[PDB]
Amino acid sequence: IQDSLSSTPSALGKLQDVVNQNAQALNTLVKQLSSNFGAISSVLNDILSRLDPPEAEVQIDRLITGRLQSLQTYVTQQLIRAAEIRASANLAATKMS
């Protein structure tokens, strides 16, 4: 058995993805911060200091809508993956017992 765990690296693949995918998802979230979402520019403080405040409300609303949408998408993804992991853990507990 020792040799197998010292030779076949992919035998632990089932425990690797559960990490990697996670990180990947979170990383995407941060990159979505660089998006423009249909405004003048992605930097909030820039349009904040470069325009008068009777119309910048529209730009801010654009940014808010986009970012809340992306973050909601991430939350739903995490929820589904958590449900799958819960099923796997229940199976493992039964197998143990």
Binding site for another protein (CB under 8 A): 1, 4-5, 11-12, 14-15, 18-19, 22, 26, 28, 31-32, 35-38, 66, 70-71, 73, 78, 81-82, 85, 88-89, 91-92, 95, 97
The entry of another protein, a copy of itself, none near residue 78 (CB within 5 to 8 angstroms by kind) is another protein
The entry of another protein, a copy of itself, none near residue 87 (CB within 5 to 8 angstroms by kind) is a copy of itself
Q: What's the CA gap between 55 and 44, in Å, rounded? A: 14
Q: What's the CA gap between 10 and 14, in Å, rounded? A: 8
Nearest in space to 47 (alpha carbons), one of 35, 31, 63:
63
